[PDB]
Amino acid sequence: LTTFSLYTIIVLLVITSLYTLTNNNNKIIGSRWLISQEAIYDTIMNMTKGQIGGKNWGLYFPMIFTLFMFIFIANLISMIPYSFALSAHLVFIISLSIVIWLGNTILGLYKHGWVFFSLFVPAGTPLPLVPLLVIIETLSYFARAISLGLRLGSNILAGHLLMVILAGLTFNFMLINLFTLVFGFVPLAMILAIMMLEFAIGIIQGYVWAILTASYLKDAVYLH
Amino acid sequence: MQLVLAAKYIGAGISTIGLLGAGIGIAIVFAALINGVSRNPSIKDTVFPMAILGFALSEATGLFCLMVSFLLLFG
Amino acid sequence: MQLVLAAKYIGAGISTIGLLGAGIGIAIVFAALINGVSRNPSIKDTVFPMAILGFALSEATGLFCLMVSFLLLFG
Amino acid sequence: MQLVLAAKYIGAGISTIGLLGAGIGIAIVFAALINGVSRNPSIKDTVFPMAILGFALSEATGLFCLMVSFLLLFG
Amino acid sequence: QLVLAAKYIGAGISTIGLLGAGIGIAIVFAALINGVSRNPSIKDTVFPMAILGFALSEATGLFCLMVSFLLLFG
Amino acid sequence: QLVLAAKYIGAGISTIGLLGAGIGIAIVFAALINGVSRNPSIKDTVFPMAILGFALSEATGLFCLMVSFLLLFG
Amino acid sequence: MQLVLAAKYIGAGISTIGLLGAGIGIAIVFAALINGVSRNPSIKDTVFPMAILGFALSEATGLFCLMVSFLLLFG
Amino acid sequence: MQLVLAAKYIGAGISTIGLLGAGIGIAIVFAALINGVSRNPSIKDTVFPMAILGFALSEATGLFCLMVSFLLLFG
Amino acid sequence: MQLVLAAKYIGAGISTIGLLGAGIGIAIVFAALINGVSRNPSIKDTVFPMAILGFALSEATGLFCLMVSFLLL
Amino acid sequence: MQLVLAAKYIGAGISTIGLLGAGIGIAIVFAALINGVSRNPSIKDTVFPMAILGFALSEATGLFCLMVSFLLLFG
Amino acid sequence: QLVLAAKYIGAGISTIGLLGAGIGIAIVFAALINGVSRNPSIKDTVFPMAILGFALSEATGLFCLMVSFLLLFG
Amino acid sequence: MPQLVPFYFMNQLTYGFLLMITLLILFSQFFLPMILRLYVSRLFISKL
Amino acid sequence: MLKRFPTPILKVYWPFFVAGAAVYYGMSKAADLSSNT
Amino acid sequence: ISYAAYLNVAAQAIRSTELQTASVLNRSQTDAFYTQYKNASEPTPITK
Amino acid sequence: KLQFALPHETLYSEVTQVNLPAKSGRIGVLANHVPTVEQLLPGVVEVMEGSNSKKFFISGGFATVQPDSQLCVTAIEAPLESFSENIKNLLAEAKKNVSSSREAAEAAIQVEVLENLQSV
């Protein structure tokens, strides 16, 4: 068995129930849980309608929605204190970032020919720095390749690892001098604040992913 | 081996330095908040969620420093 | 070993540097408070909760730093 | 041998200092955001993408720095 | 010997921590003067606030200082 | 060997340079937000200029990083 | 022996670093003084003892750095 | 020999520190450009070439530092 | 001998770092002077004594650092 | 000696750190220039000579740092 | 040879101090340009003031440089 | 949380890319248009 | 509600999918190169 | 242009859905001339 | 309290919170706010005296908190509702006018008013 494979199965079954058994009545008033995924739907609909701004704005709305939801669900499931992190296999998240970067490069080449690199010519400037402004645009174009993945990876990895080291320390803090285990609630509360923060930065990252790879698609769909 | 164990304890202290930036960062957001709210009064309904977001992001960079500190210190 | 014990004492010192950041940070929140309240003396009652929040959060980054110092000192 | 592993872990510690800059940087962007909204509360929707862009870019330099830390620590 | 040397060096490192607290005190006071000059009359509400702000700014320095003393004096 | 140790250490010290770019970038973006909030309308001219300022700020940190990879790998 | 003496002389130098923050601090209080007094023409009589208070307190932090340098230097 | 070679590399790493100030410097010029252009709506035709001069000069300090870094590193 | 004499030189070098704050400090006072004076005009004759005092104090912190350097030499 | 030639390389590296201050410095005068020029418009004829002067000495402090590096490094 | 090494290293450390004055110099002149652009006419009083501050700010860096020279020459 | 260096990268990644393609098709053709149906149904009653 | 509404993903999402296939092959080789140790 | 002229134009535009009373319209619509004079000689009454 | 005054009318000659668009961005004044002089830009204004809130479209003016906490607002003319469809039509015509044409500046101001209308 593959631990990663088992938790991907759990994610899939959660998502199937979230858009079937969420308003199985099919109310025109809408069941209360499905109101959340309506508001999310609208703030990403109207965001990727703004950003992408092409005719393919709504055509890339499902991809950007499953890029929201993937990170949103995998940063809830990975936050369960007896659940195996998909994100601890960083290689899937980073691989997805490189795949999207390459699928942007191919999209850009397809959409804007071999004059796609005119994206990295930004403006007229004095002649000795016209090539320079191509170099430090292209460097940022594949700094865009790795930055997006490593941001999300760093937040999630650091949160789980931070919590575990501090938990083990406060465990052995409680084991030593038992009078500190009495009123050992304040370090538990410090870990609680961190756990609240790790949910926050996990929900922030699913949206932040989806705005940043909307900005990258803004460049790719229409040159500049 | 005494060198490597000593290196752990030194390296921890070096890593701790990174935290200072986040500490100043939190304050910068809150200083802006206080000034801004004084200008408008009622802008706060929009702005207060933005302040929490700003705090979280500045803090997160700080946490990266802290986990490296603990990796060297504790293991 | 003299080297390991030494390393704890050196490393403790290095950790202590980080705390400086929080010191500047707390002051920055307070500066805004005085100027803000000067600009609008009646905004104070809303703002004072926000100010205390900003103090606490900035201070927290300081706490983590100081914890790492105490771990080297008294570990 | 001990020297190599020591130097690896020391080098990791030294790099961690770089993270502080991005932490301050993010905060500055949020300070600007707060001021922008308060001076024109309708600027916000346009500004929200620009703010996130600046946050990401600021953060990125720190994350590169963090890769040097991780290359040493895990590697 | 090395342990005693390390105490003295280590103590020195801790002293660097103090610089930030010093800057902090000034920042609160700068705001005090700016605020006072701005209202002429904020002073009575602000005076206990100012003392508090001073105390906290100094305090981060004090924690650094206590660590310094512990290493130096024992 | 000492030389092997030296390149690992040197790589650490060089990495710190990225710090400057992180602050730099934020100052450009902050000014962008301030300008656009001031005018409501400057943005068409300003947004290209801001991306230039960003690129240059980032670049200084990247020079530091390139030195880091030359040490670390090399 | 030599090592202990060495540590003290070096250490005295390190302690000197702390003072820079106090130096800047004093300047900041005086800068505010000029700006306030230039705004009012007349706030000065009240403000002058306020300014002295901020100066003294800022100075005191630097004094702490300095005395730690002296403790190591003079013994 | 080994010590000298080590010192070249170490000296190079240390040299790389100076670069950060020029980086921040470039941003400070560009901030003023954006700000200035927001004040006039119309200074920009004079000010844009003026700004390129300012950019080049702030950047230049970094290049002098970088040259030395390369002299230490490669040399 | 060698280690102690070396250590004195190192400690002295380190002491210069304390001075940098004073270097900036003096400028901040004078910057304030120019700003204040340009804002009010007329305050200047009153303000100038206060400025000299503030300058002296900022410099003084650096002076303490400097004399410690001289002792170590 | 190995140690002395090494010490030249290390010492040179340290000297290069000084350049950061000039990097920031140059930018500050040019920032002030752009701000000033945008504020007045027509001040520029007087002010452009002033800006070059402020550049020159600020730069010179940097050049002193560079020259000490050269003195150590080259001899 | 440790002492000779230390003279050269120590000199390097002494160089660091100059940076603060360097920033300072720019700050005085920044203020000059701000004041002059705001007022116009302030300049005739202010230009002597600017030169005084400029020199004073520099002098701290000169001290730091002087300690470098004392080490270098020995 | 504690982690080593897998060599099982391709095993993991196979299940990873499969989940993406599954969800993409599933959302895009099924579940997202069911939301667009809710919006449009509400709007058609609103118009009528 | 739950109804298939066709999306021509083979010309909408074609460059993404091409990048995925290439990386799938490349990670097989990367996994093989890492499984030596 | 002069601040009160700026505000005037704004006020006139602002009396536009229209609903407005005659007096509002009159404060925002008046016909007149300004006959400049000299140190004597009069630049002719030009519609204000 | 508040003096809110027009030449031929007075809107609100103890007002608790007032939200104003001024040459300083937007400023809100709440009880005691230290005394200011700011020229009011053409504005959409909300005035709250107690919890009751009144919504105004105001042709700009000048704003002055007095030291005695008399918020002297002087503006040329105003409710929000009075300004408010035909106005949108007219401004389109006025937008056309900007293409040709003091009249040039005037048409530019009309566009500024169009922005102010767009705020509604």
Per residue, the 3-state secondary structure of I6-47, as one string, reads HHHHHHHHHHHHHHHHHHHHHHHHHHHHHHHHHHCCCCHHHH
Last residue before each break in chain B (C–N > 2.5 Å): none
Task: Name the strand (E) or helix (H) holding O40.
Answer: strand O37-40
Residue pair C29/C11 in contact (Cβ under 8 Å)? The answer is no
Closest CA–CA distance from residue C26 to any residue of chain O (Å)? 26
* Radius of gyration for chain A, computed over Cα atoms and rounded to the nearest angstrom: 22
- Tell me how crowded residue A193 is: count the other CB atoms within 10 A of its CB: 11
Residue pair H45/J46 in contact (Cβ under 8 Å)? The answer is no
Residue J4, classified by CB atoms within 10 Å of its CB into exposed (0-12), middle (13-18) or buried (19+), is middle
For residue A109, the one-letter residue type is L
- Give the pair of three-digit tokens for residue F51: 């991306």
Chain L residues contacting M, CB < 8 Å? 5-11, 13-14, 17, 20, 24-25, 28-31, 33-34, 37
K36 Cβ partners below 8 Å, 6+ apart? I38, J36, J43, J46, J47, J50, K42, K43, K46
Rounding to the nearest 10 degrees, give the CA dihedral for residues I48, I54, I57, I59: -80
For residues E2-20, one letter each, b for 16 or more C-beta atoms within 10 angstroms of the residue's C-beta and e for the rest, the string is bbbbbbbbbbbbbbbbbbb
Please give the DSSP secondary-structure letter assigned to residue O36: -
Strand partners, O39: O62
Taking each helix axis from N to C end, the angle separating B44-73 and B2-16, rounded to the nearest 10 degrees, works out to: 170
E runs forming strands in M1-37:
none
A to B contact (≥3 Cβ pairs closer than 8 Å): yes
Task: Pick H11's closest partner by Cβ from J12, J18, J34.
Answer: J12
Residue pair A19/A11 in contact (Cβ under 8 Å)? The answer is no
- Give the pair of three-digit tokens for residue A51: 């950003």
* Dist. CA C59–CA E49, nearest whole Å: 17
Q: Which of A198, C41, H43 is nearest to B67 (CA)?
A: A198
Closest CA–CA distance from residue I73 to any residue of chain G (Å)? 10
Residue pair D15/D68 in contact (Cβ under 8 Å)? The answer is yes
CA angle J32, J34, J40 (to 5 degrees): 95
Rounding to the nearest 10 degrees, give the CA dihedral for residues H2, H4, H8, H14: 100
Maximum alpha-carbon separation in chain L: 61
Strand partners, O43: O58
Rounding to the nearest 10 degrees, give the CA dihedral for residues G15, G20, G22, G25: -160
The residue with tokens 């932040």 is A208
The domain covering O1-84 belongs, at the CATH homologous superfamily level, to: F0F1 ATP synthase delta/epsilon subunit, N-terminal (2.60.15.10)
- Tell me how crowded residue D56 is: count the other CB atoms within 10 A of its CB: 23
Q: Which of O34, O21, O23, O1 is nearest to O120 (CA)?
A: O21
* Dist. CA E34–CA E40, nearest whole Å: 10
Q: Which CATH class is domain I2-73?
A: mainly alpha
Q: Which of M12, F44, N3, N47 is nearest to A57 (CA)?
A: M12
- Give the pair of three-digit tokens for residue A113: 């020919």
Rounding to the nearest 10 degrees, give the CA dihedral for residues D5, D7, D13, D18: -130
O to A contact (≥3 Cβ pairs closer than 8 Å): no
Task: Name the strand (E) or helix (H) holding O18.
Answer: strand O17-22
- Tell me how crowded residue E37 is: count the other CB atoms within 10 A of its CB: 23
Residue A23: C-alpha distances to residues A15, A186, F57, L29, N43 (Å): 13, 41, 51, 18, 81
E runs forming strands in chain J:
none
CATH number of K1-74: 1.20.20.10
Residue pair A63/M19 in contact (Cβ under 8 Å)? The answer is no
Taking each helix axis from N to C end, the angle separating A34-51 and A185-221, rounded to the nearest 10 degrees, works out to: 40
* Dist. CA K18–CA J23, nearest whole Å: 13
Residue I70, classified by CB atoms within 10 Å of its CB into exposed (0-12), middle (13-18) or buried (19+), is exposed
CA angle D52, D58, D61 (to 5 degrees): 140
* Dist. CA O98–CA O46, nearest whole Å: 30
Task: Name the strand (E) or helix (H) holding O30.
Answer: strand O25-30
- Helix, strand and coil in chain K, % to nearest 5: 90, 0, 10
Q: Given an 8 Å threshold on Cβ–Cβ distance, is B25 in contact with D23?
A: yes
Residue A146: C-alpha distances to residues A204, D54, F60, G38, L6 (Å): 19, 17, 19, 52, 20
Q: Say whether J75 sits in a helix, a strand or coil.
A: coil
Residue O103, classified by CB atoms within 10 Å of its CB into exposed (0-12), middle (13-18) or buried (19+), is exposed
Q: Which of A101, A86, A200, A73 is nearest to A153 (CA)?
A: A86
- Tell me how crowded residue K74 is: count the other CB atoms within 10 A of its CB: 11
Cα I67 to the center of its chain, rounded Å:
12
* Dist. CA O107–CA B9, nearest whole Å: 72
Q: What are phi and psi of O27, to 5 degrees?
A: -130, 145
- Give the pair of three-digit tokens for residue A170: 């406060």
* Dist. CA I11–CA I2, nearest whole Å: 14
A94 Cβ partners below 8 Å, 6+ apart? A146, A149, A150, A153
Question: DSSP of chain B, one letter per residue?
Answer: -HHHHHHHHHHHHHHHTTHHHHHHHHHHHHHHHHHHHHHSSTTHHHHHHHHHHHHHHHHHHHHHHHHHHHHHHT-
For residues C47-58, one letter each, b for 16 or more C-beta atoms within 10 angstroms of the residue's C-beta and e for the rest, the string is beebbebbbebb
Q: Which of A151, B25, G37 is nearest to I39 (CA)?
A: G37
Question: N40 is in which domain, residue-wise?
Answer: 1-48
Residue A144: C-alpha distances to residues A141, A216, D53, D61 (Å): 5, 8, 12, 12
* Dist. CA N48–CA N34, nearest whole Å: 6
Taking each helix axis from N to C end, the angle separating E18-38 and G44-74, rounded to the nearest 10 degrees, works out to: 170
* Dist. CA D16–CA D62, nearest whole Å: 9
Q: Which of G55, A100, J13 is nearest to I55 (CA)?
A: G55
From chain A, the residues in CB contact with B56 under 8 A are 197, 200-201, 204
Side-chain-side CA neighbours of residue J15 (13 Å)? 30
* Dist. CA J11–CA A80, nearest whole Å: 53
**Pairing between β-strand O2-5 and β-strand O71-75 as defined by DSSP bridges:** parallel
* Dist. CA K12–CA J17, nearest whole Å: 9
* Dist. CA D68–CA D75, nearest whole Å: 10
For residue G22, the one-letter residue type is A
The residue length of chain O stands at 120
- Give the pair of three-digit tokens for residue A55: 């005719």
* Dist. CA J17–CA J65, nearest whole Å: 8
Task: Look at the alpha carbons of A109, A113, A117, A120 in this order and tell me if their dihedral is positive or negative.
Answer: negative
* Dist. CA K43–CA K46, nearest whole Å: 5
* Dist. CA A167–CA A161, nearest whole Å: 10
Experimental approach was cryo-EM
Residue pair O32/O71 in contact (Cβ under 8 Å)? The answer is no
Question: DSSP of H30-45, one letter per residue?
Answer: HHHHHHHHHHSSSTHH
Task: Pick G35's closest partner by Cβ from I1, I17, I35.
Answer: I35
Residue D41 touches chain O, beta carbons under 8 Å:
yes
Resolution in A: 6.5
Q: Say whether O3 sits in a helix, a strand or coil.
A: strand
Nearest CA in chain M to L26: M4
Q: Given an 8 Å threshold on Cβ–Cβ distance, is O32 in contact with C41?
A: yes
Q: Say whether O6 sits in a helix, a strand or coil.
A: coil
Q: Say whether O57 sits in a helix, a strand or coil.
A: strand
Residue pair L15/A93 in contact (Cβ under 8 Å)? The answer is no
Count: domains in chain L: 1
For residue H35, the one-letter residue type is N
Residue pair G55/G22 in contact (Cβ under 8 Å)? The answer is no
* Dist. CA I29–CA I50, nearest whole Å: 10
* Dist. CA E51–CA B59, nearest whole Å: 28
* Dist. CA O8–CA A141, nearest whole Å: 62
Q: Say whether J43 sits in a helix, a strand or coil.
A: coil
Closest CA–CA distance from residue C49 to any residue of chain O (Å)? 18
Strand partners, O40: O22, O61
* Dist. CA D6–CA C74, nearest whole Å: 23
Closest CA–CA distance from residue B6 to any residue of chain D (Å)? 8
Residue pair B65/C64 in contact (Cβ under 8 Å)? The answer is no
Which CATH number does the domain housing residue N40 bear? 1.10.1620.20
* Dist. CA C38–CA O95, nearest whole Å: 43
Maximum alpha-carbon separation in chain F: 61
Q: Given an 8 Å threshold on Cβ–Cβ distance, is B21 in contact with D20?
A: yes
Please give the DSSP secondary-structure letter assigned to residue L31: I
Query: Quick one: CATH architecture of D2-75?
Result: Up-down Bundle (1.20)
Strand partners, O65: O71
Residue ranges covered by each domain of chain O: 1-84, 87-119
* Dist. CA A149–CA A139, nearest whole Å: 17
**D-contacting chains (≥3 CB pairs under 8 Å):** A, B, F, O
CA angle G3, G4, G6 (to 5 degrees): 60
- Give the pair of three-digit tokens for residue O31: 């009880």
Q: Say whether F17 sits in a helix, a strand or coil.
A: coil
The residue with tokens 């702000």 is E53
Task: Pick I25's closest partner by Cβ from G6, G24, G59.
Answer: G24
- Give the pair of three-digit tokens for residue L20: 């993406």
- Give the pair of three-digit tokens for residue I14: 């380190």
- Give the pair of three-digit tokens for residue C35: 């100027």
For residues F23-40, one letter each, b for 16 or more C-beta atoms within 10 angstroms of the residue's C-beta and e for the rest, the string is bbbbbbbbbbbbbbbbbe
Task: Pick I13's closest partner by Cβ from K22, K58, K71.
Answer: K71
Residue pair D42/O26 in contact (Cβ under 8 Å)? The answer is no
Task: Look at the alpha carbons of H62, H63, H68, H71 in this order and tell me if their dihedral is positive or negative.
Answer: positive
- Tell me how crowded residue B72 is: count the other CB atoms within 10 A of its CB: 26
Please give the DSSP secondary-structure letter assigned to residue L29: I
* Dist. CA D6–CA C7, nearest whole Å: 13
- Give the pair of three-digit tokens for residue H7: 């010192």
Q: Which of A187, C1, A164, F23 is nearest to D26 (CA)?
A: F23
Task: Name the strand (E) or helix (H) holding N46.
Answer: strand N46-47
Ramachandran region of residue O62, left (φ > 0), alpha (ψ -120 to 50) or beta? beta
Residue pair I58/G27 in contact (Cβ under 8 Å)? The answer is yes
Residue C4: C-alpha distances to residues D26, F5, H63 (Å): 38, 20, 42
Residue G54: C-alpha distances to residues E63, G62, I11, K11 (Å): 20, 13, 31, 36
* Dist. CA M27–CA L15, nearest whole Å: 13
Q: What are phi and psi of O55, to 5 degrees?
A: -125, 130
Q: Given an 8 Å threshold on Cβ–Cβ distance, is A147 in contact with D49?
A: no
Residue A179, classified by CB atoms within 10 Å of its CB into exposed (0-12), middle (13-18) or buried (19+), is exposed
Rounding to the nearest 10 degrees, give the CA dihedral for residues F11, F14, F19, F24: -140
Residue ranges covered by each domain of chain E: 1-74
Rounding to the nearest 10 degrees, give the CA dihedral for residues A104, A105, A108, A112: 180
Q: Which of K61, K64, K57 is nearest to K10 (CA)?
A: K64
Closest CA–CA distance from residue N26 to any residue of chain O (Å)? 11
